[PDB]
Amino acid sequence: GKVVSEMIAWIKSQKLIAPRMKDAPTFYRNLEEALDVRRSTQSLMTRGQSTWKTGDAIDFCSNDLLSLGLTGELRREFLAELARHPDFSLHSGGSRVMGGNYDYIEAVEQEIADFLGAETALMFNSGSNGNIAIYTAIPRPGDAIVYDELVHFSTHTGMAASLATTKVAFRHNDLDAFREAMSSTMDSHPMLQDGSRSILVSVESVYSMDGDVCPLVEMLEIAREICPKGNFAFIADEAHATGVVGPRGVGLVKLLGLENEVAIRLNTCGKALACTGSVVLGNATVRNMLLNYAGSLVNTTAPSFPSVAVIRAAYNLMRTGATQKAQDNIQHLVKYFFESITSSDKATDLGILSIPVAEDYESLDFVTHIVPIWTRQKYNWWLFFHLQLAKIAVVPIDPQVPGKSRVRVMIHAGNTEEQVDYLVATLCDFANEMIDIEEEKGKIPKAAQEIYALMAAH
Amino acid sequence: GKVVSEMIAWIKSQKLIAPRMKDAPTFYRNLEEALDVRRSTQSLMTRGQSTWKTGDAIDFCSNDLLSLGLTGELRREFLAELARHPDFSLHSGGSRVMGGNYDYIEAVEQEIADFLGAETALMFNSGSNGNIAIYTAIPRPGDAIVYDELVHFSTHTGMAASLATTKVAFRHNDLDAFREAMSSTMDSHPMLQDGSRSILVSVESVYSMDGDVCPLVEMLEIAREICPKGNFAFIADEAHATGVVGPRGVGLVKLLGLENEVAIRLNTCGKALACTGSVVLGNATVRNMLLNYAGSLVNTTAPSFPSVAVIRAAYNLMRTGATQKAQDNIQHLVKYFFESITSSNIWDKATDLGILSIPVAEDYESLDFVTHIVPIWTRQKYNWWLFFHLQLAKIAVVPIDYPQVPKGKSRVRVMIHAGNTEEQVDYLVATLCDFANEMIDIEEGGKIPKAAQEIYALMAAH
Amino acid sequence: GKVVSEMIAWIKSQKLIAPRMKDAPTFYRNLEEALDVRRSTQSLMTRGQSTWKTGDAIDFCSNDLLSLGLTGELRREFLAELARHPDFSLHSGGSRVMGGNYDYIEAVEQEIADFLGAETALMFNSGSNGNIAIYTAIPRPGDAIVYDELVHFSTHTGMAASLATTKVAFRHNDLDAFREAMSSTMDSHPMLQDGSRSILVSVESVYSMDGDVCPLVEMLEIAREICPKGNFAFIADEAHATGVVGPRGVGLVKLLGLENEVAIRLNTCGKALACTGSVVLGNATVRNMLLNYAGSLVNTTAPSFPSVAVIRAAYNLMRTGATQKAQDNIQHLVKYFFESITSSNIWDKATDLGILSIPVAEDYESLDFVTHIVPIWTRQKYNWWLFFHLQLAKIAVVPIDYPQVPKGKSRVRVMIHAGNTEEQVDYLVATLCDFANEMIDIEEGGKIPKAAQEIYALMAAHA
Amino acid sequence: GKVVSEMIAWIKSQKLIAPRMKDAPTFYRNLEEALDVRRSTQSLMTRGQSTWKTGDAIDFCSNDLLSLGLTGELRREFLAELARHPDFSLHSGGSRVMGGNYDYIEAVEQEIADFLGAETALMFNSGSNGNIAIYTAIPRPGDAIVYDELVHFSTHTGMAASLATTKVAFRHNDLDAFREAMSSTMDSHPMLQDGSRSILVSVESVYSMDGDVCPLVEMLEIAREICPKGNFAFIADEAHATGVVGPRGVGLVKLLGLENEVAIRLNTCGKALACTGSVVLGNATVRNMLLNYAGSLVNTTAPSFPSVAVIRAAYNLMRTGATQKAQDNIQHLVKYFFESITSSWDKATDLGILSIPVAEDYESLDFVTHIVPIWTRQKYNWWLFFHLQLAKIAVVPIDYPQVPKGKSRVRVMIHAGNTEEQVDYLVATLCDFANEMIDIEEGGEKGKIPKAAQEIYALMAAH
Ligand SMILES: C/C=C/C(=N\C=C1\C(COP(=O)(O)O)=CNC(C)=C1O)C(=O)O
Ligand SMILES: C/C=C/C(=N\C=C1\C(COP(=O)(O)O)=CNC(C)=C1O)C(=O)O
Ligand SMILES: C/C=C/C(=N\C=C1\C(COP(=O)(O)O)=CNC(C)=C1O)C(=O)O
Ligand SMILES: C/C=C/C(=N\C=C1\C(COP(=O)(O)O)=CNC(C)=C1O)C(=O)O
Ligand SMILES: [Cl-]
Ligand SMILES: [K+]
Ligand SMILES: [K+]
Ligand SMILES: [K+]
Ligand code: NA
């Protein structure tokens, strides 16, 4: 059993090591001691989870949202793009600003920006590095950053490396909290009051851990109300919007017609685009600022030709209409999941199971591939184990977050209605079993009995 | 021709922009003001120099050290690598510690680890991200970091985000400074004295800025002597060693047999290996440390199959010996340059008067090996003149100036590659001696050199 | 029946074409990708709506403002104009400044000029080409243009090609915004401070998009205060005013007695005058500027005799007073509409909740006059539902949406014509109140209204 | 008489005006200053020349190439076309894509396209607007435009408005320059090299200023060689070819059998077709591209029925064979002119006094064009004009602001309705000019002016 085998390795990985580290050098003892801190809570990460790719579990976990990886469609365009460039120069040769620039990557960038409705684009090795560059290079002394509390890890790191004086979180997707944070921030800085510095607003368009969507039109209207002099600028991380939201996959910003109102956008390749990389979107002033003040970009090797070609190939497919049907299939399958799971209420009334993104899903203009499923914090591992032993691959969400743990289901275009049925039934089995147990605090459910057994066994 | 066009485009990009932004929104005014800061010292970067790629100028500037890029050898081995995996799964699917792990990347890392004498390898999308991960995940509270002053920018970004309380720089490649740094750090930290924490030493095997080599065997001795309880660990950034140094381009650590002495090694793919990416070498304790405490690795998409394949391909060409002749031709051409330029008649007079200086060429005959990095110094007031003199002669070299180094410490970096020729080297030596001659005559007679007249004329026009 | 047919054809035209183009030449693949851009927001336009012309739907959408088209009144006067010149030389023979000038066109321009109270007139083949010529020929290097944000597309095209250094927009019909724009431009340009160049002010008399009216008197006084040197000039696009506003349809500038104070006026023939073409009014200096510096006029064939004839015929019908009854009936029917819709019981509730909005209808009894243009707003999410509701109810209204306006600003434009009737207006009011009633019940009860169900079913069957 | 009266007004027009404007508003003074700038070089345009129409001068200037206007033949068919449609709806009602479409215009368009051998056709108010629409809507970001340096004003305007990154002119009708333009363009862009963007090639089939013909077969071959992936597209402006070149007037593209190889063609009505309008020819992909991305078309009034009817009438006459004789007569009269002027010549041409390049190797041309440009010394150009005019021969002067200052010339237009006797008179008047200018030259007196100029200079001194 590839699932069970991965389980025993994960079991064996949580065994404490530093008790056996007494004769060992201080450096290695301190490292294994720090690894033991995570092994103690059994939160050590080692080899991850690969059953979703080999066919041994249903893929409700991965970031291959459009199934461009699964089907080989991105690979086929990539090799074809390469074939149309038989003598391509593989190596950039150096820094993007110190000799590593070349026509192909500049043209691919502009082709991407034209597709997304932006003036210019600038390519990074990842979404994370794009966020790092944005919040390192862009904010000025005196600017403030007002951000959604659930922005990405890379956004938090970047803001910490920023020149920005004041950074303020606001409650997730909450319009009143955003208005409070902006007003108070406006009321505490005399160079924001007179418009010589700016309020930077950091949002995700689709939140990777909650699946909700940024109400961008309403936030823009609030920003103007609070900042009548126009001294604000939105920064929108679209990692989970590109290819999934908006016509032909263009993203939330362009779907809403906001490409001229949103100063900086991040569109990453690691999810629906089934590869790696990112572009940062903005005008030439924004682009020049990254080229000159993002030390990370200045001092790293510019992208190789195939890294650019594979990104071109994903945009080729979205541009030529080749992802529209997969994108519609995502909407269909997610809605179908919501329809089923909500039809089978008790467990939700009690606290056993909760899917916040399924509330009022009917009134949503669209849905997202991200389905976070909450249980009781004491039950989260058991929910994870229940689904995995059912041969359902999901991602457990726990160092990443504060008693905020949950599982994240990812619905992909390549999933089927039958697999969704199987997931709905499995979740109901897990529900029913936890209401039974609650209605002997030592009682442990079926899946967790097997896991605890393998823990005793190895 | 082309070189003049690039220079005009460069000149125009330094023209102040804030005077034309008074009606713009705040955000955009202040960004152009920040950019005007750089423009005003003529230090704004936009598209860089491209004449080396086009043939419009000799390549004494790129990082394609073994010319694996120029020849198409890496491209050929890369496409053949994809060919052997006809239906490869392109996408990782997520983070390396969530859904994104797979057999091909684990096996390619292990091939690399085996070939480089390391227990394990862990792949990142660049050398820089490898340094970020090491110094954010490895140092513990109470550790100290003693680093050579010339470590890479990304190691500075790294250390500043680390949990270590003490970071101490030593004068570049100075053993006495290193000894003064280890002892004063040790004696000032009781948790280092009793051996409950470690001193982390940060070096480059080949320093990209100066081109000299780390005295690692002697640095290790100083470290054991200063830290008797063995609470130290060496971190070697081998970005400019891999491919250029050691048998089959294994780098400096393995070339000296120190693969068991150096806890953590960084091997990048952006120079001699002619792609992007990097591997961090260590034992499984180091590796798992990176996978669990390098938040930058945890929250990023794991490399795609073509990314792993091109790295596997570059190492392939090293493993099989297909890079040996290219590695030997760097040693040859570099020694050829040194022999040629030092035999020049102006050489003594230029270096005597202070008009030219090539520190890496001092006593090159005693060196066991040489490197591809040849920094050339003139008088700071002549530096841009030296740079455009070469440029006008259709020789691409790299300009080293602010914001990369302090103002008043500008130089030029000649980079010698496998695919350069003795003809080109001769032309370079001849061009440098002509610049040296011209400055001698100016100093021995408000005259400016010919290269300076040409820049000043372009500046008057643009 | 026919409404459904065109809706199917419209749905089919939005289906993406690029996936079928893989083996086509580069040129053709890239045009269909470009077209797929618009298809992908269901924004592709092909043949538009025709039910209003065929009697299959009531005409609340066309630009045949005085119904001179519908009744054939212009056709008859045009063929009579031809009959009075039985040997007419059809062909101009070349450019208007290179051998295509002739007496008949010069004399028709002068008749139009005298009737509209302007020194001269210069004829173009469209209002658009008139605006192109004005803004490429007139502004000088150093001049500035301050334009209402809602000026016509052709004016945006003319301005982008102009010689003027500064183009400043101002908030639509906003006197405070205009003052800020005039003063900000005045205080940033020394060439305007010493009176060596001019501020050109660009407005519409009747804004095609909103149906409101430019406060021309207030704006001229603001210009005189900010420009005490008198170095300003007004340019008024009267496209939707001629035939509708002012005695015998003379338009807003002559109605206000401003023909001495507005340097350049554009009167188009494509709406109330029921044909095509335009004239630019000014003195002989303005006219000569256009004939010499408007490269678009210089390098195009001067109008044919039948083109001039139909324009003269439309102006005859206005000069003789034959259009005054039709002009007055627009006032009546529009006033009849505002009476009915703002008297419905659902009106307060619909407008309070934001389910219906008709800005132009507010305080309409105080306005000196009304216009034929009646924009109706619902929730953005409900817009196409409202449009299809009207269409299924066999009422032809104009859809206002991207790429014509920004996304999220979509609305519906009702066009009230002289040949509409109170019964038709009754049906429109009742149909609107039916939509508002239905959305009220939905918002108080994923329920979609009836019109949305019919369109969702059509999309299911084809799309 | 009127020839002379035209002169006096044209003389009076050039009198500077801004000196008398010291007290005028800035706006009006600056405009009259701008006019003075043209008046200074005797280059202000006002009323053109009409003597060719009234029979006061021989028409060797106008664009009525087939004499369809002169004979009233187009007028008769036009009125007959209208008569076959007794209840026609004159007014389009609005935008072609927003409610102004109708059956008759779509059918006339398709009838034109079928005759010209094209898949579809799309009607514009003029040839210039057709060019504007093509070059604004068609080029994509990343495409290049390689154009003959002598393309039309409207092509230059349109290109300036396009999304195209690279525009490259090549030496007129020169296949070497065209190949060098294509090669340097293909080798400067990697998206052209991989066939993901296109090179658009812009030519006239018959150049309005030079009378020579585009060597379209060889250019297509050069393009195929330089763009092996087929990522190019030709755009052929046939304004001066329809009705004049090709069997039954079909134009150059169809004559050569290249209708499948030219992506886009422009066929205008203002010359041989003797009215106004144009169509753009292409497949349904090109036509939809214009309908959606030519904002000039989207935001203007669709053509009225009589505008469509008169274009149909022109094509009816070509389709039914009723212009073939006139077309043949142009060929006859043009060749007769070349034979006469060639057999008089050598000395004038050798000295630089007179040149007619289109007369070189005129025997070895497959056909000739109606455009005959006549060159003298730049210092003698208006003098040649005044000589021809006072001889009662109407020709068109071509100078700044239409061509560069030192590229001035006179354009003779030969029409089907001219006679051999008029050609005799033209040849003799031209030889008298040449012999007079030869003498004046050989006399050494740089202050001597010719007989025609004396009368003009005298007319100037008087008024
Ligand atoms: C590999 C981790 C991927 C991942 N998210 C990464 C994100 C990143 C980082 O992008 P990346 O370095 O993978 O190219 C930025 N922004 C958002 C909103 C993200 O969700 C996820 O699984 O939810
Ligand atoms: C693009 C800049 C490359 C560059 N150096 C990058 C280095 C880096 C960063 O490598 P990278 O992020 O490009 O993969 C780490 N260490 C050392 C010693 C380096 O020299 C150089 O030009 O010397
Ligand atoms: C085809 C009809 C267009 C149209 N308006 C055209 C206008 C034009 C262009 O007129 P056109 O070229 O049709 O003769 C100029 N100015 C204003 C204010 C216009 O409203 C409309 O429907 O509102
Ligand atoms: C006003 C008439 C102009 C004129 N030609 C107009 C042309 C135009 C413009 O056509 P138009 O707007 O008069 O219908 C396009 N292309 C070419 C080649 C032309 O020669 C001429 O006398 O040659
Ligand atoms: Cl920096
Ligand atoms: K922008
Ligand atoms: K019809
Ligand atoms: K027309
Ligand atoms: Na944009």
At A269, list the tokens. Answer: 């390749």
> Domain A73-319 carries which CATH code?
3.40.640.10
Residues A202, A148: contact at Cβ < 8 Å?
A: yes
- Give the residue carrying structure tokens 């030449």: C25
Q: Which residues of A touch C15 (CB under 8 A)?
A: none
Burial (Cβ within 10 Å: 0-12, 13-18, ≥19) of residue D176: exposed
Chains B and A touch (3+ CB pairs under 8 A): yes
Second CATH level (architecture) for the domain B49-66+325-461 = Alpha-Beta Complex (3.90)
Distance set, CA C110 to CA C98, C107, C123, C281, D113 (Å): 20, 5, 10, 10, 39
Which residues have a C–N gap over 2.5 Å right after them in chain A?
344, 398, 402, 439
Residues 57-86 in B contacting A (C-alpha not used; CB under 8 Å) = 61-64, 68-69, 72, 74-75, 78-79, 82
Tokens encoding C259? 């023909």
The percent of chain D in helix, strand and coil, each rounded to the nearest 5, is 50, 15, 40
Domain spans in chain D, listed from the N-terminal domain onward: 49-66+325-462, 73-319
Instruction: Name the method of structure determination.
Output: X-ray
* DSSP notation for C62-130: -S-TT-TTTTSHHHHHHHHHHHTSTT------SBTTTT---HHHHHHHHHHHHHTT-SEEEEESSHHHH
Q: Is the peptide bond before D401 cis (omega within 30 degrees of 0)?
A: yes
Is there a contact between D34 and C293 (Cβ–Cβ < 8 Å)?
yes
Q: For chain C, what is the total number of helices (H) and then of strands (E)?
A: 18, 12
Give the closest residue to C253 by CA, choosing from C238, C233, C243: C238
Residues C246/C324, Cβ–Cβ less than 8 Å = no
> What superfamily would CATH give domain A49-66+325-457?
Aspartate Aminotransferase, domain 1 (3.90.1150.10)
Architecture category of domain D49-66+325-462 in CATH:
Alpha-Beta Complex (3.90)
Q: Could you tell me if B305 and B313 are in contact, meaning their C-beta atoms sit under 8 angstroms apart?
A: no
Chains that touch A (3 or more CB pairs under 8 A): B, C, D
How close is the nearest chain C Cα to the Cα of D247, in Å? 23
SS3 for A109-148 is HHHHHHHHCCCEEEEECCHHHHHHHHHHHCCCCCCEEEEE
Q: Which amino acid is at C117?
A: G
CB contact under 8 A, A140 and B195: no
Strand-strand pairing, B166-170 and B144-148: parallel
3-state secondary structure of D278: strand
Q: Do A25 and B230 meet the contact criterion of CB atoms below 8 Å apart?
A: yes
Ligand 1 pocket mutation, candidates B96, B300, B307, criterion most atoms within 8 A of CB:
B300
The residue among A448, A415, A399, A325 whose CA lies nearest residue A7 is A448
Helix (H) or strand (E) holding C383: helix C383-392
Q: Does A363 touch chain C (CB under 8 A)?
A: yes
Residue D80: CB atoms within 10 Å: 12
Residue B443 near residue B385 (C-beta atoms within 8 A)? no
Chains touching B (3+ CB pairs < 8 Å): A
Give how far B129 is from chain A: nearest CA, Å.
Answer: 9
**B208 close to A (CB below 8 A):** no
Among B252, B205, B204, B198, which residue's Cα sits nearest to residue B227? B198
Do residue D91 and residue C101 have CB atoms under 8 angstroms apart? no
Q: What is D29-79 written as a DSSP string?
A: HHHHHHHHHHHTTT---SS---TTTTTSSEESS-S-TT-TTTTSHHHHHHH
Closest approach atom of ligand 2 to CA A96: 1
Structure tokens at D307: 């505008």
Nearest ligand (C-alpha, residue A97): 2
Q: List, in sequence order, the alpha helices (H) in D84-143.
A: 103-116, 127-137
Which run of H or E residues covers position D202?
Answer: strand D199-204
Query: How far does the CA of residue D271 sit from the closest CA of chain C (Å)?
Result: 7
Cα–Cα distance for residue pair B214/C256, rounded to 1 Å:
88
- Listed by the residue before each break, gaps in chain D with C–N over 2.5 Å are 344
CA pair distance D196, B79, nearest whole angstrom: 22
Q: Which residues of D376-409 are buried (b: 16+ CB within 10 A; e: fewer)?
A: bbeebbbbbbbbbbbbbbbbbbbbeebeeeeebb
Residues of chain B with Cβ-Cβ distance to A296 below 8 Å are 128, 154, 157
Which residues are CB-neighbours of C320 under 8 A, at least 6 positions away? none
Q: Which of D296, B121, A246, D52 is nearest to C130 (CA)?
A: D296
CB contact under 8 A, B62 and A102: no
CA distances (Å), origin A384, targets A12, A374, A388, A409, D196: 18, 11, 6, 11, 47
Give the closest residue to B108 by CA, choosing from B319, B260, B295.
Answer: B319
Q: b/e string for A102-129 if b means 16 or more Cβ within 10 A? A: bebbbbbbbbbbbbbbbbbbbbbbbbbb
Residues D108-127 as b/e (b if ≥16 CB within 10 A, e otherwise) read bbeebbebbbbbbbbbbbbb
Q: What is the C-alpha separation between D391 and D424, in angstroms, rounded?
A: 13
For ligand 8, an ion, list residues with CB under 5 A.
C 125; D 125, 276
**Per-residue burial over C421-441, b = 16 or more CB atoms within 10 Å of its CB, e = otherwise:** eeebbeebbebbbbbbbbbbe
Which chain C residue shows the shortest CA-CA distance from A258?
C407
Closest CA to B244 of B234, B254, B235, B258: B254
How far are the Cα atoms of B68, B261, C452, D229 from residue A104, in angstroms, in the given order? 19, 44, 46, 19
Cα angle, residue C139 at apex, residues C138 and C144 outer, rounded to 5°: 150
Breaks in chain C (C–N > 2.5 Å) following residue: 445
Cα(first)–Cα(last) distance of chain D, in Å?
16
